Amino acid sequence: EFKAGSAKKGATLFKTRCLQCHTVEKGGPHKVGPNLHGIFGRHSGQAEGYSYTDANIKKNVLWDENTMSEYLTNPKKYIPGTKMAFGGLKKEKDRNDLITYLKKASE
């Protein structure tokens, strides 16, 4: 599903649609949502010091581009009971862009 996109456009999507709840940089603080540094390649629910729902932890998904993509289409469907209040990125090109950005910034 996932196809490489534009990191630049991904940056704008993140600013607009995610930054209110999430920081990305190494050492960034938690907010409404967890800091996302190092999210890719990790199991869900493992950002240190963050208070996750049991739903998020029990999902037991390894985050990669493709699982991220399916998650961001409809977070509540992918992880029933998650407290992440976000409807979804419905456009495939938006998911691709955001993920391209996030893969790089969260490294």
Ligand code: HEC
């Ligand atoms: C606040 C209203 C949020 C917005 C906007 C976005 N997210 Fe979020 N996210 C939020 C919370 C409170 C949580 C924790 C959910 C829980 O049930 O505990 C999350 C979780 C994520 C995760 C999973 C993290 C994990 O460690 O497994 C990811 C990957 C994530 N959020 C990404 C994400 C992106 C890319 C967003 C922009 C589209 C976004 N979130 C919006 C709160 C909020």
